Amino acid sequence: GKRQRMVMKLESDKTFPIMLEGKINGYACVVGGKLFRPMHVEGKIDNDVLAALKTKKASKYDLEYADVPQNMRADTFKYTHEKPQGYYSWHHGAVQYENGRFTVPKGVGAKGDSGRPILDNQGRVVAIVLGGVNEGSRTALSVVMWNEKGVTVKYTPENCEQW
Amino acid sequence: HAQTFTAAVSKTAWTWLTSLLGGSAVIIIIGLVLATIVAMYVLTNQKHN
Structure with a gap:
Protein backbone atom coordinates (compact mmCIF):
# COMPACT_ATOMS: atom_id res chain seq x y z
CA GLY A 1 0.00 0.00 0.00
CA LYS A 2 2.10 2.88 1.31
CA ARG A 3 5.38 1.13 0.43
CA GLN A 4 4.80 1.59 -3.31
CA ARG A 5 3.92 5.24 -2.63
CA MET A 6 7.21 5.69 -0.75
CA VAL A 7 9.07 4.05 -3.65
CA MET A 8 7.34 6.42 -6.09
CA LYS A 9 8.18 9.41 -3.88
CA LEU A 10 11.85 8.45 -3.49
CA GLU A 11 12.42 7.30 -7.10
CA SER A 12 10.47 10.15 -8.76
CA ASP A 13 13.18 12.51 -10.04
CA LYS A 14 16.28 10.30 -9.72
CA THR A 15 15.02 7.38 -11.84
CA PHE A 16 15.09 7.84 -15.62
CA PRO A 17 13.71 5.20 -18.01
CA ILE A 18 15.41 3.93 -21.16
CA MET A 19 13.42 4.38 -24.36
CA LEU A 20 13.68 2.17 -27.46
CA GLU A 21 11.17 3.23 -30.15
CA GLY A 22 8.65 4.06 -27.42
CA LYS A 23 9.26 0.92 -25.33
CA ILE A 24 10.47 1.08 -21.73
CA ASN A 25 13.04 -1.69 -21.31
CA GLY A 26 15.23 -0.54 -18.42
CA TYR A 27 16.00 2.02 -15.74
CA ALA A 28 19.29 3.72 -14.92
CA CYS A 29 20.44 4.68 -11.44
CA VAL A 30 22.02 7.95 -10.27
CA VAL A 31 23.91 7.29 -7.03
CA GLY A 32 27.20 8.57 -5.60
CA GLY A 33 27.81 10.78 -8.61
CA LYS A 34 27.63 7.69 -10.80
CA LEU A 35 25.21 6.58 -13.52
CA PHE A 36 24.66 2.82 -13.47
CA ARG A 37 23.14 1.32 -16.63
CA PRO A 38 23.26 -2.31 -17.85
CA MET A 39 24.58 -3.79 -21.09
CA HIS A 40 21.60 -5.75 -22.42
CA VAL A 41 19.20 -2.80 -22.07
CA GLU A 42 19.88 -0.80 -25.24
CA GLY A 43 18.28 2.54 -26.01
CA LYS A 44 18.37 6.28 -25.51
CA ILE A 45 18.41 8.02 -22.12
CA ASP A 46 15.22 10.02 -21.50
CA ASN A 47 17.20 12.67 -19.62
CA ASP A 48 18.98 15.18 -21.84
CA VAL A 49 21.95 15.73 -19.51
CA LEU A 50 22.76 12.05 -18.88
CA ALA A 51 22.46 11.09 -22.56
CA ALA A 52 25.26 13.39 -23.79
CA LEU A 53 28.07 11.67 -21.87
CA LYS A 54 30.47 8.75 -22.29
CA THR A 55 29.98 5.64 -20.15
CA LYS A 56 32.93 3.43 -19.27
CA LYS A 57 32.05 -0.25 -19.64
CA ALA A 58 32.49 -3.36 -17.51
CA SER A 59 31.18 -6.47 -19.25
CA LYS A 60 32.15 -8.89 -16.47
CA TYR A 61 30.26 -6.92 -13.80
CA ASP A 62 27.56 -6.03 -16.40
CA LEU A 63 27.68 -2.29 -15.67
CA GLU A 64 28.21 0.96 -17.54
CA TYR A 65 29.23 3.85 -15.31
CA ALA A 66 29.79 7.57 -15.83
CA ASP A 67 30.51 10.77 -13.91
CA VAL A 68 27.53 12.86 -12.81
CA PRO A 69 28.45 16.60 -12.69
CA GLN A 70 28.75 18.48 -9.41
CA ASN A 71 25.44 20.38 -9.80
CA MET A 72 23.49 17.09 -9.48
CA ARG A 73 25.54 15.07 -6.93
CA ALA A 74 23.37 16.24 -4.02
CA ASP A 75 20.19 14.95 -5.72
CA THR A 76 21.30 11.30 -5.88
CA PHE A 77 20.40 8.10 -4.04
CA HIS B 1 85.68 -33.78 -42.09
CA ALA B 2 81.90 -33.79 -41.77
CA GLN B 3 79.42 -30.90 -41.87
CA THR B 4 77.50 -31.17 -38.62
CA PHE B 5 74.34 -29.10 -38.34
CA THR B 6 74.99 -26.25 -35.88
CA ALA B 7 78.74 -26.76 -35.94
CA ALA B 8 79.84 -23.14 -36.42
CA VAL B 9 77.52 -21.25 -34.12
CA SER B 10 80.30 -19.24 -32.38
CA LYS B 11 79.16 -18.98 -28.71
CA THR B 12 78.31 -15.26 -28.84
CA ALA B 13 75.49 -16.14 -31.23
CA TRP B 14 74.39 -18.88 -28.83
CA THR B 15 74.05 -16.10 -26.26
CA TRP B 16 72.06 -13.90 -28.66
CA LEU B 17 69.73 -16.77 -29.64
CA THR B 18 69.32 -17.82 -26.00
CA SER B 19 68.47 -14.27 -24.92
CA LEU B 20 66.00 -13.62 -27.77
CA LEU B 21 64.44 -17.07 -27.32
CA GLY B 22 64.39 -17.35 -23.53
CA GLY B 23 63.55 -13.85 -22.34
CA SER B 24 60.28 -13.98 -24.28
CA ALA B 25 59.36 -17.26 -22.57
CA VAL B 26 60.31 -15.79 -19.16
CA ILE B 27 58.09 -12.75 -19.80
CA ILE B 28 55.14 -14.84 -20.95
CA ILE B 29 55.30 -17.25 -17.99
CA ILE B 30 55.52 -14.40 -15.48
CA GLY B 31 52.54 -12.85 -17.27
CA LEU B 32 50.59 -16.10 -16.87
CA VAL B 33 51.56 -16.39 -13.18
CA LEU B 34 50.52 -12.75 -12.66
CA ALA B 35 47.17 -13.49 -14.34
CA THR B 36 46.60 -16.47 -12.03
CA ILE B 37 47.49 -14.42 -8.92
CA VAL B 38 45.15 -11.61 -10.04
CA ALA B 39 42.31 -14.11 -10.55
CA MET B 40 42.86 -15.57 -7.07
CA TYR B 41 42.97 -12.05 -5.59
CA VAL B 42 39.64 -11.20 -7.27
CA LEU B 43 38.08 -14.40 -5.89
CA THR B 44 39.47 -13.52 -2.45
CA ASN B 45 38.14 -9.94 -2.51
CA GLN B 46 34.71 -11.07 -3.72
CA LYS B 47 34.50 -13.66 -0.93
CA HIS B 48 33.37 -11.09 1.63
CA ASN B 49 30.26 -10.61 -0.51
Whole structure:
Protein backbone atom coordinates (compact mmCIF):
# COMPACT_ATOMS: atom_id res chain seq x y z
CA GLY A 1 0.00 0.00 0.00
CA LYS A 2 2.10 2.88 1.31
CA ARG A 3 5.38 1.13 0.43
CA GLN A 4 4.80 1.59 -3.31
CA ARG A 5 3.92 5.24 -2.63
CA MET A 6 7.21 5.69 -0.75
CA VAL A 7 9.07 4.05 -3.65
CA MET A 8 7.34 6.42 -6.09
CA LYS A 9 8.18 9.41 -3.88
CA LEU A 10 11.85 8.45 -3.49
CA GLU A 11 12.42 7.30 -7.10
CA SER A 12 10.47 10.15 -8.76
CA ASP A 13 13.18 12.51 -10.04
CA LYS A 14 16.28 10.30 -9.72
CA THR A 15 15.02 7.38 -11.84
CA PHE A 16 15.09 7.84 -15.62
CA PRO A 17 13.71 5.20 -18.01
CA ILE A 18 15.41 3.93 -21.16
CA MET A 19 13.42 4.38 -24.36
CA LEU A 20 13.68 2.17 -27.46
CA GLU A 21 11.17 3.23 -30.15
CA GLY A 22 8.65 4.06 -27.42
CA LYS A 23 9.26 0.92 -25.33
CA ILE A 24 10.47 1.08 -21.73
CA ASN A 25 13.04 -1.69 -21.31
CA GLY A 26 15.23 -0.54 -18.42
CA TYR A 27 16.00 2.02 -15.74
CA ALA A 28 19.29 3.72 -14.92
CA CYS A 29 20.44 4.68 -11.44
CA VAL A 30 22.02 7.95 -10.27
CA VAL A 31 23.91 7.29 -7.03
CA GLY A 32 27.20 8.57 -5.60
CA GLY A 33 27.81 10.78 -8.61
CA LYS A 34 27.63 7.69 -10.80
CA LEU A 35 25.21 6.58 -13.52
CA PHE A 36 24.66 2.82 -13.47
CA ARG A 37 23.14 1.32 -16.63
CA PRO A 38 23.26 -2.31 -17.85
CA MET A 39 24.58 -3.79 -21.09
CA HIS A 40 21.60 -5.75 -22.42
CA VAL A 41 19.20 -2.80 -22.07
CA GLU A 42 19.88 -0.80 -25.24
CA GLY A 43 18.28 2.54 -26.01
CA LYS A 44 18.37 6.28 -25.51
CA ILE A 45 18.41 8.02 -22.12
CA ASP A 46 15.22 10.02 -21.50
CA ASN A 47 17.20 12.67 -19.62
CA ASP A 48 18.98 15.18 -21.84
CA VAL A 49 21.95 15.73 -19.51
CA LEU A 50 22.76 12.05 -18.88
CA ALA A 51 22.46 11.09 -22.56
CA ALA A 52 25.26 13.39 -23.79
CA LEU A 53 28.07 11.67 -21.87
CA LYS A 54 30.47 8.75 -22.29
CA THR A 55 29.98 5.64 -20.15
CA LYS A 56 32.93 3.43 -19.27
CA LYS A 57 32.05 -0.25 -19.64
CA ALA A 58 32.49 -3.36 -17.51
CA SER A 59 31.18 -6.47 -19.25
CA LYS A 60 32.15 -8.89 -16.47
CA TYR A 61 30.26 -6.92 -13.80
CA ASP A 62 27.56 -6.03 -16.40
CA LEU A 63 27.68 -2.29 -15.67
CA GLU A 64 28.21 0.96 -17.54
CA TYR A 65 29.23 3.85 -15.31
CA ALA A 66 29.79 7.57 -15.83
CA ASP A 67 30.51 10.77 -13.91
CA VAL A 68 27.53 12.86 -12.81
CA PRO A 69 28.45 16.60 -12.69
CA GLN A 70 28.75 18.48 -9.41
CA ASN A 71 25.44 20.38 -9.80
CA MET A 72 23.49 17.09 -9.48
CA ARG A 73 25.54 15.07 -6.93
CA ALA A 74 23.37 16.24 -4.02
CA ASP A 75 20.19 14.95 -5.72
CA THR A 76 21.30 11.30 -5.88
CA PHE A 77 20.40 8.10 -4.04
CA LYS A 78 22.07 7.02 -0.82
CA TYR A 79 24.18 3.88 -0.50
CA THR A 80 25.50 1.72 2.33
CA HIS A 81 27.09 -1.66 3.00
CA GLU A 82 25.66 -2.51 6.44
CA LYS A 83 22.73 -4.85 5.75
CA PRO A 84 21.04 -7.43 8.02
CA GLN A 85 18.83 -10.30 6.88
CA GLY A 86 15.06 -9.99 6.62
CA TYR A 87 12.80 -7.72 4.57
CA TYR A 88 13.46 -4.81 2.21
CA SER A 89 11.36 -2.50 0.04
CA TRP A 90 11.08 -3.01 -3.72
CA HIS A 91 9.00 -1.27 -6.40
CA HIS A 92 6.51 -4.14 -6.54
CA GLY A 93 6.29 -4.50 -2.77
CA ALA A 94 8.71 -6.47 -0.60
CA VAL A 95 11.87 -8.52 -1.15
CA GLN A 96 13.46 -11.04 1.20
CA TYR A 97 17.18 -11.07 2.01
CA GLU A 98 18.06 -14.56 3.27
CA ASN A 99 21.53 -16.19 3.36
CA GLY A 100 22.93 -13.35 1.27
CA ARG A 101 20.31 -13.93 -1.43
CA PHE A 102 17.48 -11.72 -2.67
CA THR A 103 14.19 -13.55 -3.25
CA VAL A 104 10.93 -12.21 -4.72
CA PRO A 105 7.56 -14.02 -4.57
CA LYS A 106 6.08 -15.04 -7.91
CA GLY A 107 3.41 -13.33 -9.98
CA VAL A 108 5.62 -10.34 -10.81
CA GLY A 109 8.65 -10.25 -13.10
CA ALA A 110 8.80 -9.71 -16.86
CA LYS A 111 11.05 -8.11 -19.49
CA GLY A 112 11.54 -4.41 -18.79
CA ASP A 113 11.94 -4.01 -15.03
CA SER A 114 15.75 -4.16 -15.06
CA GLY A 115 17.79 -1.62 -13.10
CA ARG A 116 15.35 -0.90 -10.27
CA PRO A 117 17.32 -0.33 -7.03
CA ILE A 118 16.41 -2.10 -3.80
CA LEU A 119 15.67 0.24 -0.88
CA ASP A 120 15.53 -0.23 2.88
CA ASN A 121 13.45 1.18 5.75
CA GLN A 122 15.70 4.27 5.95
CA GLY A 123 16.07 5.12 2.25
CA ARG A 124 19.42 3.69 1.12
CA VAL A 125 20.12 1.57 -1.97
CA VAL A 126 21.44 -1.86 -1.02
CA ALA A 127 21.29 -3.68 -4.40
CA ILE A 128 20.50 -3.13 -8.09
CA VAL A 129 18.16 -5.60 -9.80
CA LEU A 130 19.70 -6.98 -12.99
CA GLY A 131 18.17 -10.42 -13.55
CA GLY A 132 15.96 -13.13 -12.10
CA VAL A 133 15.53 -16.90 -12.08
CA ASN A 134 12.37 -18.85 -11.26
CA GLU A 135 12.96 -21.15 -8.28
CA GLY A 136 9.92 -23.23 -7.34
CA SER A 137 7.47 -20.75 -5.88
CA ARG A 138 9.91 -17.98 -4.94
CA THR A 139 12.21 -16.48 -7.56
CA ALA A 140 15.81 -15.45 -6.90
CA LEU A 141 17.57 -12.30 -8.11
CA SER A 142 20.91 -11.84 -9.88
CA VAL A 143 22.09 -8.47 -8.55
CA VAL A 144 25.15 -6.44 -7.57
CA MET A 145 26.04 -5.08 -4.13
CA TRP A 146 28.97 -3.70 -2.14
CA ASN A 147 30.85 -4.74 1.01
CA GLU A 148 32.89 -3.26 3.85
CA LYS A 149 36.17 -3.41 1.90
CA GLY A 150 34.75 -1.65 -1.16
CA VAL A 151 34.57 -4.41 -3.78
CA THR A 152 31.51 -4.58 -6.05
CA VAL A 153 30.27 -8.17 -5.75
CA LYS A 154 27.97 -9.51 -8.48
CA TYR A 155 25.71 -12.33 -7.27
CA THR A 156 24.31 -14.58 -9.99
CA PRO A 157 22.35 -17.82 -9.44
CA GLU A 158 22.20 -20.69 -11.90
CA ASN A 159 20.42 -20.37 -15.29
CA CYS A 160 19.17 -16.80 -14.91
CA GLU A 161 17.19 -14.95 -17.58
CA GLN A 162 18.12 -11.33 -18.27
CA TRP A 163 15.28 -8.82 -17.94
CA HIS B 1 85.68 -33.78 -42.09
CA ALA B 2 81.90 -33.79 -41.77
CA GLN B 3 79.42 -30.90 -41.87
CA THR B 4 77.50 -31.17 -38.62
CA PHE B 5 74.34 -29.10 -38.34
CA THR B 6 74.99 -26.25 -35.88
CA ALA B 7 78.74 -26.76 -35.94
CA ALA B 8 79.84 -23.14 -36.42
CA VAL B 9 77.52 -21.25 -34.12
CA SER B 10 80.30 -19.24 -32.38
CA LYS B 11 79.16 -18.98 -28.71
CA THR B 12 78.31 -15.26 -28.84
CA ALA B 13 75.49 -16.14 -31.23
CA TRP B 14 74.39 -18.88 -28.83
CA THR B 15 74.05 -16.10 -26.26
CA TRP B 16 72.06 -13.90 -28.66
CA LEU B 17 69.73 -16.77 -29.64
CA THR B 18 69.32 -17.82 -26.00
CA SER B 19 68.47 -14.27 -24.92
CA LEU B 20 66.00 -13.62 -27.77
CA LEU B 21 64.44 -17.07 -27.32
CA GLY B 22 64.39 -17.35 -23.53
CA GLY B 23 63.55 -13.85 -22.34
CA SER B 24 60.28 -13.98 -24.28
CA ALA B 25 59.36 -17.26 -22.57
CA VAL B 26 60.31 -15.79 -19.16
CA ILE B 27 58.09 -12.75 -19.80
CA ILE B 28 55.14 -14.84 -20.95
CA ILE B 29 55.30 -17.25 -17.99
CA ILE B 30 55.52 -14.40 -15.48
CA GLY B 31 52.54 -12.85 -17.27
CA LEU B 32 50.59 -16.10 -16.87
CA VAL B 33 51.56 -16.39 -13.18
CA LEU B 34 50.52 -12.75 -12.66
CA ALA B 35 47.17 -13.49 -14.34
CA THR B 36 46.60 -16.47 -12.03
CA ILE B 37 47.49 -14.42 -8.92
CA VAL B 38 45.15 -11.61 -10.04
CA ALA B 39 42.31 -14.11 -10.55
CA MET B 40 42.86 -15.57 -7.07
CA TYR B 41 42.97 -12.05 -5.59
CA VAL B 42 39.64 -11.20 -7.27
CA LEU B 43 38.08 -14.40 -5.89
CA THR B 44 39.47 -13.52 -2.45
CA ASN B 45 38.14 -9.94 -2.51
CA GLN B 46 34.71 -11.07 -3.72
CA LYS B 47 34.50 -13.66 -0.93
CA HIS B 48 33.37 -11.09 1.63
CA ASN B 49 30.26 -10.61 -0.51
